[PDB]
Amino acid sequence: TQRIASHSHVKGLGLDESGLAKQAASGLVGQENAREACGVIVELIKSKKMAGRAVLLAGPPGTGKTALALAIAQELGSKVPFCPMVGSEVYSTEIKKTEVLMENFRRAIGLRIKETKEVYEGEVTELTPCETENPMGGYGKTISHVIIGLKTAKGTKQLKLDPSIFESLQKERVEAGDVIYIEANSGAVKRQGRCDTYATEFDLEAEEYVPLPKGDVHKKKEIIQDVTLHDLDVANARPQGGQDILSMMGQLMKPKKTEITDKLRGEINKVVNKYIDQGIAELVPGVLFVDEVHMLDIECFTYLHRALESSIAPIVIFASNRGNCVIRGTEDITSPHGIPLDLLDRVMIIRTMLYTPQEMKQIIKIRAQTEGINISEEALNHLGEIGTKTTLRYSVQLLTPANLLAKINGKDSIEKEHVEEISELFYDAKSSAKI
Amino acid sequence: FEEWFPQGRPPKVPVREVCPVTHRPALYRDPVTDIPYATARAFKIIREAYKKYITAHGLPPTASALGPGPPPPEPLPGSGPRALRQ
Amino acid sequence: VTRIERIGAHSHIRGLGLDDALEPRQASQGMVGQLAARRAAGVVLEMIREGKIAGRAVLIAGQPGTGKTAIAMGMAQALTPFTAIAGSEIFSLEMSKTEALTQAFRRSIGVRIKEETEIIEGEVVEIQGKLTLKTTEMETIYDLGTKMIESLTKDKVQAGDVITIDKATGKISKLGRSFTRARDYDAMGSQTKFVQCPDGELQKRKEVVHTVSLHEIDVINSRTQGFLALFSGDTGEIKSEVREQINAKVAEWREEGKAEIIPGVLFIDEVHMLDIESFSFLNRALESDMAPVLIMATNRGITRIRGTSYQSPHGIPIDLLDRLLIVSTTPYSEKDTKQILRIRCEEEDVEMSEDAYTVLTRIGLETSLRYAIQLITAASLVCRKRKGTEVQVDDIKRVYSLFLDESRSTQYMKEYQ
Amino acid sequence: RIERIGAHSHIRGLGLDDALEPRQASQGMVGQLAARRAAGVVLEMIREGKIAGRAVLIAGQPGTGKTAIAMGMAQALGPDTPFTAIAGSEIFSLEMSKTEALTQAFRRSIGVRIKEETEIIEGEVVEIQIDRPAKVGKLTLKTTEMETIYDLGTKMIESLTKDKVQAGDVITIDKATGKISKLGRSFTRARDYDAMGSQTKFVQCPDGELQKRKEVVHTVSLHEIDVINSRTQGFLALFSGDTGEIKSEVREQINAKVAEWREEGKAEIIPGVLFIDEVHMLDIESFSFLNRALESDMAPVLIMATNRGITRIRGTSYQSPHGIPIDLLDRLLIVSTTPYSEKDTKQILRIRCEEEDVEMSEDAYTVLTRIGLETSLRYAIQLITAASLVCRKRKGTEVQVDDIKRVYSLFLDESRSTQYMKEYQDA
Ligand SMILES: Nc1ncnc2c1ncn2[C@@H]1O[C@H](COP(=O)(O)OP(=O)(O)O)[C@@H](O)[C@H]1O
Ligand SMILES: Nc1ncnc2c1ncn2[C@@H]1O[C@H](COP(=O)(O)OP(=O)(O)O)[C@@H](O)[C@H]1O
Ligand SMILES: Nc1ncnc2c1ncn2[C@@H]1O[C@H](COP(=O)(O)OP(=O)(O)O)[C@@H](O)[C@H]1O
């Protein structure tokens, strides 16, 4: 299911090799200076040299601030994490605002952790070659080595493992004919189950028979797991393993999202650095796109302009849509963009001008193309004219309903009559203001 | 030494049973006749053959069903060691 | 016989009566008047059915009593997940507005999941070490492993029990013995109810489709799942567990065909009471991929937005107004009023005279329409008291004199207590 | 090692002389000799710790380096002394009152160095022969100068069986509890097993057979109260903030036992610092609490920063300087930060460039100092980064005037944003 979203045509900033801006910028049109600033900041992000830097996508409504935000996000690629957040999400009834902001900052930061493990598997043929008793002591019966005949699909390879592991072999039901999961360093044996070759159709049992391993006995499984710092925080927050945690009444209330700074910073950062400099993981700072930043309370901005001061804070892309308005939580304290004047000094303002009527027509045409419906020249011109009259977002919403009206009327392309009828069946707020 | 190391022979890979009425991979095992089967028609034919056998000392003929190209043996000697139903 | 659901405030409308070409009729499925609004409702309904796009919101405007909620209920009945809520439902003490609104959005989307597994079922004849499973058309013996042996004892399986066992050693004793019920004359256990012996092949694969909404985040929320699915459930709904796990799993199931999504509709009646926070959140939530079609209703014109001293059309921010298709309704006329009153009387099993209908329409024009809709049943009950077979003008006049309307009520408030 | 440079990474201490004389440029700081000397003397007082309950308020215009001098003091204080940095809006918690959060923050910046006498036996296990009944065992520890064999007990044998210790393992066994702690290996394992390959650790101490009085100083903050409030404390010490513990029998008892330890020589108190950035966000109730909470003997040094003059106190209507009530404002002493001049701005920009490893021409430095003196310093650093990126994209070696001038138009300042804002986008 394609499930076309509101604005999915944006695929990237579409900047030329020289870094300038063009019209057909991979879905997004116009906004030359804004897209160039987006390119500069995405180059910054890719550099991964600076932290705690914020940028403000100030601009009137309809300038496609969220559009260019998703464009730069896609340009960054799925490699680096991108956590979208709206100012309303900060208001939580169970966890304070600043801690939600810190959790979002952590989510915005990524971390790839590699893990290589040398493991041996295959059908076992246990046999202990009798050896003279310990030569340092007396005589008797001892075992200096324990040979395990691991048989894999590719062949057979006997391993003369250490004799001390014999306890593990006897611990689990390791009988001749089952698949075992050996570990190089640890040596612990974990039986996977009997081989399917012995799973007679008349034997009723499940989870006990497994297929033979494909490949050499010695396998060096390399696996990479990308988890944000917030994932590690949550994992180390709650407990696991016994301790009467199975209770329902006094424990089912899992929403204990409350978090402290000691655990968040400190030990977690240190272990992350140890994994980084040791070669076990690679840090991947992402981006935190915060739209409707003006909706945050002053208690949120006062914590933002302090968290951005930290060396670990990721890149934040604020997108304020309102203009000069009183800061929330303050007594008639008017500030530009609804953001305190102190935080605006820490953010780079990327201004976005209004779309030219030609840009409106281009946007309408590319949205119609993405939708997959053909529109005649006259219909497209009428759509552009009405998008110039009222908000541009009204025109793009008139494509699908006009398309369905055309399809039901027996015609394929959206004729001017269809859009004309839809404009009278549906209209915008500017016309609805006539109460 | 014997307890911690039960040096037993391999698991003696079992037989790949086959349905005697249709020659397909047997999916079931008739209880009274103790011969594998895979379909309801096969079960009915097996029950009829077992009834014919238990009727007399031993069924002289052998029931035939779904004879492929090569000469089908029509297996009577697929001895069912199980006794009477009840 | 009286049932749970009965004639109510919006039960007369069986649906959004429209033609094949979305040409609204005069009155077919109980609904009358509002031709343009009806055609807009049909267009948005066809858009919903198509499911080609996501993140589309429609605002139903008009004066009070213009049939906005009526059109919404008609579209819902003609529309298949549907979620109708109010601005006060999302306001929860243990869940922030954003969390409740996200839960509603995800619950407004449906998801079908096809499950295919191997099943073995039959009457147990005798066990042991080995099972002897019987069915109507055959019988089979099975060797029991350690896990199967343990399950045969932890659950008191015995002869005659119609057992069921799929893969993963998930045994089930659905119901008790078939024939042995005879000797259980007096008492019969609570769980030991009886069933008919199954037929057909013993081992059979069954394909079943599980229909669940995208709100399954609660299922993968805590260690126990079924518990939270009845009451409020969990309140946290961590963003990670919601987006990075459920959305990706649904996308993978769609790719491999294991599951298919069906976007529903989210009808938020009386959206004017929402706070600026909810509107700001919606501004982004409507931009997501798995966003359902949103419908709203509001009776406000130029009013203040709750939570701020600002005023805007429909009592909501301008940022969102640029994202909605406004479908304003038109007040009913004499003929439309009389026809809707006729429909209401026919649905409520009330018979009235022509003069009675004329007086009722005159009242509904001088006063609100719901007032006349209630006068219908009031005069019907008065006539029943008088034992008459049809409601006359005298009954409606007596009721008009008994029950007061907003206008007359306010006019008679001169006492001022 | 992978940690990006932040806004206050250029500073790496508070440049001071033997006589506390401030220097022009050192340790990443520039100018502001008065406030820097105040920071130095308050840091000396902190490191002294003889007096409790002292407060200092860092006031000044935005961009004067309040958070800068705060981080400089934090760095100069160095480890072994807690420095709890917190924002004024972090005390507002939905599971603990403001006063409770302030108590947590105060007790979190106080440390107690707990002395503990240990007796650890270490060496190389030459023989770990154990006789399992399925009871008897002997351990042969070897050092570079002596050897000794120890008869193992049942519980000690079980503990050794828990943590697998093969011959040649470097272990440090605590004679008090018998905890098995493996440090490494002295040689390979028979060169024959086709697994378990690792590196060999250096030999043990010659006298490692029996270390008598190994002194280990366990340092912990006064936040240990979380260890007592609930039977399970890890949940509260790690994530859970719902720690509305009982003040009686917890605070008083812990303080009494800490005093007893200090008197008996077990532990020593090391008061830290509590830095509340943008303290003006605190409610008047929080200020009233700080007024009294700052009088206890366990009160840390309370450093605060305000970026306002006459402003209303949150939670009330009347106004007071710095948004702080007259009482608390008069109690503390204020350290005013004078704005930076053109030379100081240029030097700070150069230090930042050196930190970012970016180079630019002299004309670039001049024009950027001009722009920073006009708009702001932080905006000048933003332009530094933007111009460095534009130069990297341009394949150049250093940032010239044409890159700073380009990024000046590409990225706007609030002063120009509000100018272009006359389009009445919204209100
Ligand atoms: N340059 C552009 N090219 C194509 N479509 C655009 C462009 N700018 C905006 N749009 C359209 O505008 C709609 C929403 O824009 P958005 O990013 O929400 O701006 P705002 O958040 O200010 O309303 C999207 O559906 C997108 O299709
Ligand atoms: N066109 C119509 N067809 C049928 N019933 C109608 C129609 N218009 C209004 N009604 C009746 O009007 C009553 C109240 O209208 P209501 O839906 O509350 O108005 P609003 O849409 O402003 O909320 C309902 O009980 C409904 O039965
Ligand atoms: N003395 C200084 N040396 C270097 N940078 C400074 C100095 N003072 C202020 N800054 C810079 O100005 C910006 C904000 O000033 P800051 O240090 O936070 O002081 P304040 O807290 O008064 O704003 C920061 O990016 C910081 O790097």
Side-chain angles (χ1 to χ4, degrees):
Chain A
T1 61
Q2 71 299 329
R3 197 77 204 280
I4 298 173
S6 179
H7 45 44
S8 298
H9 63 271
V10 300
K11 306 301 298 303
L13 300 176
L15 303 180
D16 62 333
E17 74 296 348
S18 180
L20 280 294
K22 58 179 179 178
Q23 300 296 349
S26 63
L28 182 55
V29 300
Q31 303 304 141
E32 285 66 4
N33 298 20
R35 285 194 284 96
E36 289 176 1
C38 297
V40 170
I41 61 180
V42 75
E43 182 64 12
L44 196 165
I45 295 160
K46 293 175 180 179
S47 182
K48 299 183 293 184
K49 180 59 179 299
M50 299 296 296
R53 295 179 58 88
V55 63
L56 181 61
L57 303 176
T63 52
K65 56 184 68 58
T66 304
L68 58 78
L70 297 182
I72 180 172
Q74 294 295 351
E75 179 172 347
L76 285 167
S78 60
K79 301 301 299 184
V80 305
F82 179 83
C83 179
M85 175 178 61
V86 63
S88 180
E89 285 172 0
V90 175
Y91 297 96
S92 180
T93 59
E94 297 181 350
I95 175 169
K96 56 183 179 182
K97 310 181 189 66
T98 61
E99 205 65 17
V100 172
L101 292 173
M102 177 49 58
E103 289 178 0
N104 302 323
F105 277 48
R106 286 282 174 171
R107 290 188 186 89
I109 301 173
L111 179 63
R112 305 193 192 93
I113 307 177
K114 62 171 67 177
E115 182 64 12
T116 182
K117 55 182 180 298
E118 182 65 10
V119 297
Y120 313 144
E121 69 297 343
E123 183 181 357
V124 306
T125 302
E126 62 86 6
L127 63 95
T128 57
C130 298
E131 182 62 14
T132 304
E133 204 270 6
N134 304 22
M136 192 181 187
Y139 57 91
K141 180 187 294 300
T142 196
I143 305 179
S144 61
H145 297 77
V146 175
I147 298 172
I148 184 174
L150 301 183
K151 179 189 295 300
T152 182
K154 195 183 71 171
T156 306
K157 182 176 180 178
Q158 299 181 358
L159 305 182
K160 200 166 192 176
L161 303 177
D162 178 82
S164 188
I165 195 63
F166 89 105
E167 183 178 0
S168 300
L169 280 297
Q170 184 63 12
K171 186 65 176 181
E172 288 72 14
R173 284 68 54 82
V174 181
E175 81 299 351
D178 67 338
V179 182
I180 304 303
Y181 192 86
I182 307 297
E183 302 186 17
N185 298 23
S186 181
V189 306
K190 300 180 179 61
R191 63 187 303 275
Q192 300 291 2
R194 308 223 69 180
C195 300
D196 295 336
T197 57
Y198 313 106
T200 182
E201 188 64 12
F202 313 100
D203 179 71
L204 178 57
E205 187 175 2
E207 199 266 352
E208 188 65 10
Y209 298 89
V210 299
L212 286 65
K214 299 177 66 176
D216 188 3
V217 177
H218 293 199
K219 292 182 177 176
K220 187 173 181 176
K221 299 183 179 182
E222 169 57 17
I223 56 179
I224 55 179
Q225 184 179 0
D226 185 4
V227 293
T228 60
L229 300 177
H230 181 267
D231 299 330
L232 301 176
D233 304 333
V234 173
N236 295 272
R238 78 295 190 274
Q240 289 189 341
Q243 199 169 209
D244 193 5
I245 301 297
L246 288 67
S247 60
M248 290 65 66
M249 178 175 176
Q251 187 271 355
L252 180 54
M253 298 305 302
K254 183 175 180 299
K256 295 186 177 182
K257 299 170 64 178
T258 55
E259 175 59 19
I260 197 175
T261 185
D262 178 70
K263 206 287 300 308
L264 177 63
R265 305 176 58 187
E267 307 302 337
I268 284 181
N269 299 20
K270 287 180 179 181
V271 298
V272 168
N273 297 127
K274 288 176 181 180
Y275 287 2
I276 289 164
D277 61 0
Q278 184 174 0
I280 302 173
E282 298 77 2
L283 187 63
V284 183
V287 183
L288 180 64
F289 172 67
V290 185
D291 64 325
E292 305 296 349
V293 57
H294 59 71
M295 189 55 55
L296 301 175
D297 197 336
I298 185 168
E299 298 181 0
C300 302
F301 301 117
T302 189
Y303 181 84
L304 284 171
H305 68 194
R306 209 280 296 184
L308 294 172
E309 307 297 346
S310 63
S311 180
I312 192 171
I315 306 300
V316 185
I317 300 178
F318 297 112
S320 183
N321 186 21
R322 292 183 178 181
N324 56 331
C325 196
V326 303
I327 303 172
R328 298 208 67 195
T330 65
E331 297 182 359
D332 62 288
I333 301 300
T334 303
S335 62
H337 312 280
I339 306 177
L341 200 70
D342 189 7
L343 176 56
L344 294 174
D345 192 11
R346 289 175 174 85
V347 308
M348 298 183 297
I349 300 85
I350 296 174
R351 180 169 60 91
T352 62
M353 293 295 296
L354 183 61
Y355 296 159
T356 308
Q358 207 292 330
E359 298 182 5
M360 301 295 194
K361 171 263 183 179
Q362 289 183 355
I363 292 170
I364 294 169
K365 180 59 176 180
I366 188 172
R367 289 296 307 169
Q369 180 179 355
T370 302
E371 182 63 11
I373 179 58
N374 303 91
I375 303 180
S376 300
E377 185 64 12
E378 301 295 349
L380 183 61
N381 182 19
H382 185 67
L383 290 172
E385 289 178 0
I386 62 179
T388 53
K389 293 176 182 179
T390 175
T391 181
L392 75 171
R393 190 180 299 92
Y394 171 82
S395 298
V396 59
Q397 293 182 353
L398 261 60
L399 307 180
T400 302
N403 176 19
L404 290 172
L405 184 64
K407 184 176 181 179
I408 295 168
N409 191 20
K411 290 177 286 180
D412 186 5
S413 300
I414 295 175
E415 187 174 0
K416 183 178 179 180
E417 189 279 343
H418 301 152
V419 296
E420 181 62 14
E421 179 62 14
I422 297 292
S423 61
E424 299 181 0
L425 186 61
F426 303 86
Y427 52 86
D428 64 326
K430 189 178 70 61
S431 58
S432 185
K434 181 176 66 176
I435 304 301
Chain B
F1 182 88
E2 191 280 341
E3 182 178 0
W4 290 85
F5 304 106
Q7 297 180 351
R9 80 301 183 274
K12 184 144 64 61
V13 178
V15 178
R16 306 299 182 182
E17 294 295 349
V18 64
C19 181
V21 180
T22 50
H23 301 277
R24 67 176 58 183
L27 302 177
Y28 308 95
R29 176 178 295 275
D30 186 316
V32 188
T33 66
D34 192 1
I35 195 69
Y37 70 94
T39 60
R41 168 266 200 84
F43 178 88
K44 294 177 181 180
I45 291 174
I46 291 164
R47 275 295 224 273
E48 292 178 0
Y50 181 86
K51 289 179 179 180
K52 295 171 183 178
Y53 183 90
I54 189 63
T55 302
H57 303 273
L59 185 64
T62 177
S64 64
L66 207 173
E74 307 173 4
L76 180 59
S79 60
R82 184 61 172 84
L84 179 140
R85 303 185 300 92
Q86 302 179 2
Chain C
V1 61
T2 180
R3 310 173 82 270
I4 290 289
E5 58 275 6
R6 67 199 75 94
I7 177 56
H10 300 277
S11 302
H12 64 284
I13 45 171
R14 301 298 188 277
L16 184 65
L18 252 60
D19 298 333
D20 301 0
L22 283 60
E23 184 64 11
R25 303 168 180 171
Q26 180 60 17
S28 181
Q29 297 179 347
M31 186 183 299
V32 64
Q34 308 293 0
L35 300 177
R38 278 160 54 85
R39 192 169 187 177
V43 169
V44 62
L45 181 62
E46 294 295 350
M47 185 185 300
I48 294 157
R49 293 176 183 275
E50 187 187 13
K52 179 59 60 56
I53 54 177
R56 295 293 298 267
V58 175
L59 178 60
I60 304 177
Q63 301 180 3
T66 55
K68 305 189 302 304
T69 303
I71 293 169
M73 296 293 86
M75 186 193 304
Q77 191 67 3
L79 180 66
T80 310
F82 191 95
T83 299
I85 58 179
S88 181
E89 302 183 13
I90 60 177
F91 295 169
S92 181
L93 302 176
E94 72 288 357
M95 295 189 300
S96 179
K97 301 182 292 301
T98 296
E99 278 60 2
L101 192 52
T102 305
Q103 290 178 10
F105 266 73
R106 298 184 69 84
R107 179 166 53 88
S108 177
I109 296 174
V111 184
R112 302 196 187 91
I113 300 170
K114 59 181 68 175
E115 183 64 11
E116 184 177 1
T117 61
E118 292 71 1
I119 287 284
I120 301 173
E121 57 181 359
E123 277 181 345
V124 177
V125 181
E126 54 176 0
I127 61 182
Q128 186 177 3
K130 57 174 65 176
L131 177 63
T132 63
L133 201 63
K134 168 177 172 296
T135 175
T136 304
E137 297 182 0
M138 60 179 64
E139 185 177 0
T140 301
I141 303 182
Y142 290 95
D143 299 0
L144 300 178
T146 57
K147 305 171 187 177
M148 292 298 177
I149 290 167
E150 290 177 0
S151 58
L152 264 302
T153 57
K154 288 185 290 185
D155 298 70
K156 291 196 174 186
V157 177
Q158 51 192 273
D161 300 1
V162 183
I163 207 174
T164 302
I165 169 55
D166 66 329
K167 302 298 100 179
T169 186
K171 302 191 80 73
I172 307 96
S173 181
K174 71 189 199 185
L175 285 176
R177 300 166 177 264
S178 180
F179 286 87
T180 311
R181 75 189 78 188
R183 53 78 158 181
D184 295 326
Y185 300 97
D186 299 70
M188 185 263 292
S190 71
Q191 312 307 140
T192 65
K193 296 188 292 186
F194 319 104
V195 70
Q196 186 187 150
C197 173
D199 57 357
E201 298 181 359
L202 193 69
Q203 181 176 359
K204 187 178 183 180
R205 65 191 305 93
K206 301 180 180 180
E207 186 279 344
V208 62
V209 181
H210 299 165
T211 61
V212 300
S213 60
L214 189 59
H215 194 200
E216 60 183 1
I217 54 169
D218 188 6
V219 187
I220 311 305
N221 176 276
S222 60
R223 52 188 284 272
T224 182
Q225 319 187 143
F227 195 178
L228 281 58
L230 302 178
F231 71 101
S232 62
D234 184 304
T235 59
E237 301 297 350
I238 301 174
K239 182 67 68 174
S240 61
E241 299 181 0
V242 171
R243 70 188 177 182
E244 185 63 14
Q245 297 181 356
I246 300 301
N247 304 20
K249 289 166 184 177
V250 171
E252 292 178 0
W253 298 353
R254 290 156 46 183
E255 291 292 353
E256 276 60 8
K258 180 178 177 181
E260 58 182 0
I261 61 178
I262 43 174
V265 184
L266 179 61
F267 176 70
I268 303 176
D269 198 339
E270 310 299 348
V271 68
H272 64 269
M273 62 161 294
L274 264 64
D275 197 337
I276 54 163
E277 300 179 2
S278 53
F279 297 112
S280 60
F281 174 79
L282 289 171
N283 290 11
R284 186 190 64 82
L286 199 69
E287 315 299 344
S288 60
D289 192 332
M290 298 185 298
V293 181
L294 208 174
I295 303 179
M296 306 179 182
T298 179
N299 309 330
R300 323 300 294 186
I302 306 302
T303 59
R304 183 187 64 84
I305 309 177
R306 295 185 65 267
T308 55
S309 60
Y310 313 144
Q311 300 180 0
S312 63
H314 307 283
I316 65 185
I318 294 285
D319 301 69
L320 182 60
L321 282 166
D322 301 0
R323 308 175 183 274
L324 318 178
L325 295 180
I326 302 176
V327 179
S328 61
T329 56
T330 308
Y332 299 92
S333 61
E334 184 67 7
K335 184 177 181 180
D336 300 0
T337 302
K338 185 175 181 179
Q339 193 166 8
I340 61 171
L341 294 171
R342 287 270 185 83
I343 294 171
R344 258 288 162 181
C345 297
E346 291 178 0
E347 292 293 352
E348 297 179 1
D349 190 2
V350 179
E351 300 180 0
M352 314 184 67
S353 300
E354 298 294 350
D355 301 330
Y357 279 107
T358 302
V359 173
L360 186 68
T361 309
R362 186 264 296 182
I363 294 169
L365 263 293
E366 294 183 352
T367 61
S368 180
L369 180 58
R370 306 182 185 89
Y371 185 73
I373 294 171
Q374 294 179 332
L375 291 177
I376 289 168
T377 308
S380 181
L381 296 171
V382 170
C383 182
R384 187 192 302 180
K385 285 295 300 185
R386 192 174 66 271
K387 220 70 68 177
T389 186
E390 185 178 7
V391 185
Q392 300 180 0
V393 63
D394 58 359
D395 307 330
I396 182 172
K397 291 299 300 184
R398 180 67 186 279
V399 179
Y400 184 91
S401 60
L402 289 170
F403 298 93
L404 286 64
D405 190 68
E406 177 176 354
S407 60
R408 311 212 313 281
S409 64
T410 302
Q411 290 293 354
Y412 276 79
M413 282 178 64
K414 304 303 299 184
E415 300 180 0
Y416 298 143
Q417 61 175 359
Chain D
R1 60 178 180 84
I2 296 298
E3 292 294 350
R4 297 92 61 189
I5 52 173
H8 300 288
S9 58
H10 64 298
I11 55 174
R12 302 183 182 277
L14 176 58
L16 300 169
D17 301 0
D18 59 330
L20 202 72
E21 182 64 12
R23 288 174 291 186
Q24 182 177 359
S26 181
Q27 303 183 10
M29 290 186 176
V30 174
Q32 195 75 248
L33 285 64
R36 287 174 70 269
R37 186 175 181 85
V41 62
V42 66
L43 179 62
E44 183 66 13
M45 187 191 303
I46 291 158
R47 284 184 283 90
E48 186 184 13
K50 182 174 180 178
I51 65 94
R54 201 73 68 196
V56 187
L57 181 61
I58 306 176
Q61 307 300 346
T64 53
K66 301 187 293 299
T67 307
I69 189 172
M71 270 56 184
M73 288 184 294
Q75 181 61 13
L77 184 60
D80 307 329
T81 307
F83 188 100
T84 302
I86 187 176
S89 61
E90 297 184 35
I91 57 147
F92 301 90
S93 180
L94 306 179
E95 299 295 349
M96 58 181 181
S97 59
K98 305 169 188 176
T99 181
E100 207 290 333
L102 290 176
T103 52
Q104 290 180 2
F106 272 62
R107 302 186 69 85
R108 186 178 303 170
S109 59
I110 300 297
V112 285
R113 300 210 189 92
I114 301 174
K115 178 183 173 184
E116 292 293 353
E117 295 291 358
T118 60
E119 42 282 348
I120 304 175
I121 62 184
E122 58 181 358
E124 299 181 0
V125 285
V126 179
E127 180 174 1
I128 195 175
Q129 183 178 0
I130 289 167
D131 302 2
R132 172 169 52 266
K135 300 295 184 180
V136 182
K138 299 186 295 183
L139 192 68
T140 302
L141 297 177
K142 176 262 184 179
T143 55
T144 58
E145 292 292 353
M146 57 181 298
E147 301 180 0
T148 303
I149 186 175
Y150 304 90
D151 185 4
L152 297 174
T154 58
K155 186 172 289 183
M156 180 58 184
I157 287 167
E158 199 286 335
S159 60
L160 291 171
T161 53
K162 281 186 171 181
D163 184 3
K164 304 299 182 181
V165 168
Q166 189 172 359
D169 300 337
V170 178
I171 60 182
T172 56
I173 308 307
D174 184 4
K175 189 177 183 63
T177 60
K179 177 169 59 55
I180 312 306
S181 300
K182 301 181 68 176
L183 283 60
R185 290 194 57 83
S186 50
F187 35 80
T188 184
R189 282 165 284 189
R191 296 200 309 174
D192 299 328
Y193 312 137
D194 303 359
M196 308 182 296
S198 61
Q199 184 268 3
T200 62
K201 185 60 175 60
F202 190 78
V203 296
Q204 269 289 14
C205 168
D207 195 4
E209 292 294 353
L210 178 60
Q211 227 63 4
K212 299 93 180 66
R213 298 288 77 180
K214 277 288 290 185
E215 183 179 0
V216 61
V217 179
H218 180 58
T219 62
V220 62
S221 60
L222 280 181
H223 196 197
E224 57 183 355
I225 272 68
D226 57 359
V227 182
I228 312 301
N229 56 7
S230 180
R231 62 204 305 181
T232 56
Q233 62 84 13
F235 313 152
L236 309 181
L238 293 175
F239 70 104
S240 177
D242 183 5
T243 57
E245 63 185 342
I246 304 173
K247 68 96 180 179
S248 180
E249 217 282 324
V250 182
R251 279 56 165 79
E252 286 69 4
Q253 181 56 217
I254 290 291
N255 298 331
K257 202 80 182 179
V258 169
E260 289 180 6
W261 295 352
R262 181 182 58 81
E263 182 61 15
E264 302 171 77
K266 178 177 177 180
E268 57 179 359
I269 195 70
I270 43 172
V273 181
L274 178 59
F275 174 68
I276 304 180
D277 199 358
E278 292 82 28
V279 66
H280 56 263
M281 290 284 97
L282 296 185
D283 195 335
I284 191 170
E285 303 178 359
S286 296
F287 291 115
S288 180
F289 177 78
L290 293 173
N291 177 19
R292 185 66 177 86
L294 189 61
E295 303 176 0
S296 178
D297 61 330
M298 297 295 184
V301 178
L302 181 62
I303 303 179
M304 292 165 288
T306 50
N307 192 82
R308 287 170 162 80
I310 307 304
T311 302
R312 83 184 195 84
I313 303 173
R314 302 187 66 264
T316 176
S317 60
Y318 77 98
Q319 302 181 355
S320 184
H322 306 276
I324 305 178
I326 298 173
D327 186 5
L328 183 63
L329 185 67
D330 190 1
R331 286 176 58 86
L332 59 77
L333 32 65
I334 306 173
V335 176
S336 62
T337 60
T338 307
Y340 300 96
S341 180
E342 183 178 0
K343 302 178 181 179
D344 299 0
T345 301
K346 181 179 292 184
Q347 199 169 26
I348 293 169
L349 295 166
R350 187 180 302 277
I351 292 169
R352 170 56 62 179
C353 296
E354 293 293 352
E355 183 64 12
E356 299 185 0
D357 305 330
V358 306
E359 295 72 5
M360 62 182 61
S361 60
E362 185 64 11
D363 301 330
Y365 279 112
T366 303
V367 64
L368 181 51
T369 303
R370 180 181 177 182
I371 294 296
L373 179 63
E374 291 180 0
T375 60
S376 52
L377 180 60
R378 50 181 106 251
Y379 181 75
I381 298 173
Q382 295 165 17
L383 293 187
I384 287 171
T385 303
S388 176
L389 299 157
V390 168
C391 179
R392 292 171 183 177
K393 180 61 177 298
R394 185 170 56 84
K395 308 178 291 301
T397 59
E398 62 182 2
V399 186
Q400 288 76 16
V401 177
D402 66 336
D403 299 330
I404 176 55
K405 184 177 180 179
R406 192 281 203 278
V407 298
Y408 177 79
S409 180
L410 188 63
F411 296 97
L412 303 176
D413 186 69
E414 62 85 9
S415 61
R416 290 183 293 168
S417 181
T418 57
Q419 179 179 353
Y420 302 144
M421 196 177 186
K422 84 301 184 178
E423 295 183 358
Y424 53 90
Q425 55 181 348
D426 192 329

